[PDB]
Design an enzyme around this catalytic site. Structure first.
Site, mmCIF file in Angstrom:
data_model
loop_
_atom_site.group_PDB
_atom_site.id
_atom_site.type_symbol
_atom_site.label_atom_id
_atom_site.label_comp_id
_atom_site.label_asym_id
_atom_site.label_seq_id
_atom_site.Cartn_x
_atom_site.Cartn_y
_atom_site.Cartn_z
ATOM 1 N N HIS B 276 0.833 -1.195 0.000
ATOM 2 C CA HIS B 276 0.000 0.000 0.000
ATOM 3 C C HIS B 276 0.869 1.246 0.000
ATOM 4 O O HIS B 276 0.668 2.155 -0.790
ATOM 5 C CB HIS B 276 -0.890 0.002 1.247
ATOM 6 C CG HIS B 276 -1.875 1.130 1.305
ATOM 7 N ND1 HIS B 276 -3.151 1.043 0.776
ATOM 8 C CD2 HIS B 276 -1.791 2.350 1.879
ATOM 9 C CE1 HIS B 276 -3.798 2.173 1.000
ATOM 10 N NE2 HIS B 276 -2.996 2.982 1.672
ATOM 11 N N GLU B 277 1.873 1.278 0.856
ATOM 12 C CA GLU B 277 2.770 2.412 0.866
ATOM 13 C C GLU B 277 3.626 2.465 -0.389
ATOM 14 O O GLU B 277 3.976 3.563 -0.847
ATOM 15 C CB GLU B 277 3.630 2.365 2.124
ATOM 16 C CG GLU B 277 2.798 2.328 3.440
ATOM 17 C CD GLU B 277 1.802 3.437 3.599
ATOM 18 O OE1 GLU B 277 1.966 4.485 2.964
ATOM 19 O OE2 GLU B 277 0.850 3.270 4.377
ATOM 20 N N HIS B 280 1.768 4.501 -3.105
ATOM 21 C CA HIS B 280 1.990 5.932 -2.937
ATOM 22 C C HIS B 280 3.345 6.303 -3.482
ATOM 23 O O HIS B 280 3.480 7.246 -4.265
ATOM 24 C CB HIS B 280 1.942 6.330 -1.469
ATOM 25 C CG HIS B 280 0.561 6.381 -0.875
ATOM 26 N ND1 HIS B 280 -0.476 7.071 -1.458
ATOM 27 C CD2 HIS B 280 0.069 5.883 0.289
ATOM 28 C CE1 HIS B 280 -1.557 6.965 -0.702
ATOM 29 N NE2 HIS B 280 -1.252 6.249 0.360
HETATM 30 ZN ZN LIG Z 1 -2.946 5.453 1.745
#
Ligand SMILES: [Zn+2]
Ligand SMILES: [Zn+2]
Lengths: 510, 510
Positions: B276-277, B280
């Site tokens: 998830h990171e 980004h």
């Molecule tokens: Zn997020």
């Protein structure tokens, strides 16, 4: 506007600059430890933008207005008061920052950057010829900066400048002048050569090969952490990380960081380097937090800073008592020490050897390297020596001081970055730190009782508390010469250092 | 002063602010990873001083002068041009920053700090009664901020505000308005409840207990690094470190950093959290470096940012193809997987369960949590609901949307920090990121060919290159609604997300 109102405005403004600058301290730490390989160009741009901001804040004309209104007020009449200490420093930094023409700051900054990066590659290539133009330019603008600063009135209360150099030296070592260094170093030189001569005639050891056995890097790290904890470094207020070139860096109260470098095949570098950086850090952690961001709460000079690193590296860290305490542990964690005695190890870590390279010199020979750089820098700025004739004059003084001379430029006049970075008047501070350290240490023993027995039991905290109450607590309240005299009762002298060496090495080298 | 000269002055000034602010980004990273335990109070003071500086630079009247001289010039007539994109954003930030009275910014900042710290302890204590006054105050000043911003003319080229809320929502999701969210989320709600209802009636598995066997933390770290490398995260331009609360943070070109948290007894958290990171970070690494420091080079919104994190966490990271590729490796490194089949594992990591806590919700139930927060926030700002009646209206909507209701305040209305931090109009972005992600993903498959087979062989780079050419390369050139339509051909819709879920979960839950 009263003097009190102006002093408050000035304290708020100056403290805010320190906070912004400390984000620069954090980025500089990160640049040498955690930064990704591809993040350097951006980091440089960030540092450059911070530097412009700080330059604006440090020359804001408001600082002159507020200073004008505080100076001569009753608030500052006592030179020993916080406000006097602060204003003394704020004035002197403001005047020096305003007196340099932007033209000159920019050319100097550029010339030092060009000469540093050219020097990185040219030293392995032994390329004096291509380096000299870069150094010539840096010297010239440095000399021009010296004249600008010399023509300012010195700070009220300090010895006047005696000559051009003092204007540079004063930036690194407030109040220190060549005419004090001259007798100081003359005494040191005579004493070191005599002691070297006796060591050379000894025919005793040391077995340095012990230190070049294997010493697993991770065990070095764990052992250094034990040392840091026993000596009083507050790991809850710091941290230890690897880097290419060890340094210490203070980010703020509660946050003082150490870095070091280990070598699988050389014990000294990482252990004594960790201790050396610990000494710096212990000074920073012992400065008074209620004055952070002001001159009353800053370290007073590079000499005193280096006196605290050298205190813990050598006077503690390389002492019999220290290793009486920690040698058993080292035999538990390092296989290469199983067949090694305490007496062998203590002698080995204290080996003495005239050598060409200053950064690798033992504590007996190291300061002679500084004397020659001092002698050459004075010749340059007095107009008696030219950068072109520097390689011959270098080897001449390396032969007279140390009895060994370089055969090339790589391990000779080009060995250190300092001159390419425009660091003139910087080198003497290394030696002042050694002389101060022994002078402090001698008073501490006289007031606390001999320290060898205390070290042997791991009792380091009273001596640490003593350096806090005598040195760290004072910040920049006293110029170094005055601080040394308030703690020890005498002006800085070479004799305690020589006495310390004479006793330590009379015993090791019979 | 021509418009060109004013645009250059404005670009230089705005870029310099970004560099200074990025030292804030570095300190915020350090605060959550490397900072010593005793260094927080100083760090806060550093952050506070940086914030004052940035507030001065962001409201410097010179920005108004330069904008006045650029606006209406030919340089900006093309809304798709760099200069138009930049000036559009610079104007809108300047006007919003100047329009808030210092009195209001200071009380709001104070009320959010007080309510955050009170909320930390009050949630474990289930203490609504003591928290409500703090939240009441934050709402009020937030509502007052909304009215100030609402009364500004919206940015030229965007839908007008429809109601008060839109003034908040626009800060997090430029151009997004409630009257677009309403149909979007109504369609999503109907489709999720129908799909939940079919999952509930399935009588199939999943064996989640597999995920709660042991998974040594250090093996998780090594496995996540393999995943990061295979998916295209540039570790030479980043790094991965542990933290208490995972986040990603962009320091500058070449320096984009990830953090994560591992759990010895729960596979998902650290693996999918790392992915998830990573999503980004992949956005930040794919933004165009020649526009760093300007709106043309910044991420366009939280919705689009979250679309990239969710793309890699779920659409890639939780797909059959992904685990066809990496499951063999996971059985090599994790003993708890020796007796586990691919089919079991893929179903387990995709378990669905109505639950009270949003931050632990599966991808099918998660967005219903956002709908209720949206519905409540609209009620508040439309003056139809009072903070006192929030706990009843919360459970009412948790029962209607998810079929489960909290029995206390701790795991009910107090579960998230956002409202105490004054983050209103923030939550919808989480869902917009999921809807965008599937919409982007559907076009990518249509243009690139089905991606499951490519994932199964570890071929992730073409899809990554596609997100760079379609999304990351654009920066803030296009408002999200416009960017979604330029990449996919249609306005944002819930149908691709629902189609993606319907197919994935029709197969897992029979
Ligand atoms: Zn997020
Ligand atoms: Zn040092």
């Amino acid at each position: 506007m009263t003097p009190e109102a102006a002093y408050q405005n000035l304290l708020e403004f100056q403290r805010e600059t320190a906070y912004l600058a400390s984000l620069g301290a954090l980025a500089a730490w990160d640049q040498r430890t955690m930064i990704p390989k591809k993040g350097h160009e951006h980091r440089a741009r960030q540092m450059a933008a911070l530097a412009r901001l700080l330059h604006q804040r440090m020359t804001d004309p408001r600082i002159g207005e507020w200073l004008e209104k505080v100076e001569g007020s009753p608030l500052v009449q006592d030179p020993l008061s916080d406000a006097a200490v602060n204003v003394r420093e704020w004035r002197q930094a403001y005047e020096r920052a305003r007196a340099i023409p932007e033209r000159l700051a920019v050319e100097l900054a550029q010339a030092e950057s060009e000469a540093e990066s050219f020097w990185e590659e040219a030293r392995p290539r032994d390329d004096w010829r291509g380096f000299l133009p870069y150094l010539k330019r840096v010297y010239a603008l440095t000399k021009e900066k010296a004249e600008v600063l010399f023509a300012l009135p010195p700070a009220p209360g300090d010895p006047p400048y005696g000559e051009l150099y003092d204007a540079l030296l004063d930036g690194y070592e407030p109040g220190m002048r060549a005419r004090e260094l001259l007798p100081l170093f003359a005494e040191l030189k005579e004493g070191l050569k005599g002691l070297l001569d006796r060591i050379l005639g000894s025919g005793k050891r040391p077995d340095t090969s012990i230190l070049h056995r294997p010493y697993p890097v991770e065990a070095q790290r764990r052992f250094a952490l034990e040392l840091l904890s026993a000596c009083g470094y507050d790991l809850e207020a710091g941290r230890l990380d690897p880097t290419a070139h060890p340094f210490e860096i203070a980010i703020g109260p509660g946050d003082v960081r150490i870095t070091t470098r280990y070598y699988e095949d050389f014990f000294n570098a990482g252990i004594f380097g960790t201790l050396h950086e610990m000494g710096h850090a212990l000074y920073e952690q012992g400065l008074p937090k209620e004055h952070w961001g002001t001159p009353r709460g800053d370290a007073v000079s590079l000499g005193v800073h280096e006196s605290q690193s050298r205190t813990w590296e050598n006077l503690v860290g390389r002492s019999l008592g220290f290793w009486e305490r920690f040698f058993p542990r080292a035999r538990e964690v390092f296989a290469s020490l199983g067949d090694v005695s305490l007496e062998d190890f203590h002698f080995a870590v204290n080996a003495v050897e005239p050598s060409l390279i200053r950064v690798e010199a033992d504590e007996v020979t190291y300061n002679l390297h500084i004397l020659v750089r001092l002698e050459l820098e004075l010749a340059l700025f007095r107009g008696e020596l030219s950068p072109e004739d520097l390689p011959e004059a270098w080897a001449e003084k390396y032969r007279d001081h140390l009895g060994v001379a370089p055969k090339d430029y790589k391990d000779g006049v080009m060995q250190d970055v300092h001159w390419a970075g425009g660091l003139f008047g910087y080198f003497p501070t290394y030696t002042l730190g050694n002389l101060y350290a022994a002078q402090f240490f001698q008073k501490a023993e006289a007031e606390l009782g001999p320290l060898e027995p205390r070290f042997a039991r791991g009792e380091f905290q009273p001596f640490l508390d003593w350096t806090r109450a005598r040195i760290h607590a004072e910040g920049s309240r006293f110029r170094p010469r005055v601080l040394v005299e308030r703690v020890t009762g005498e002006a800085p002298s070479a004799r305690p250092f020589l006495a310390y060496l004479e006793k330590k090495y009379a015993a090791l080298y019979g």
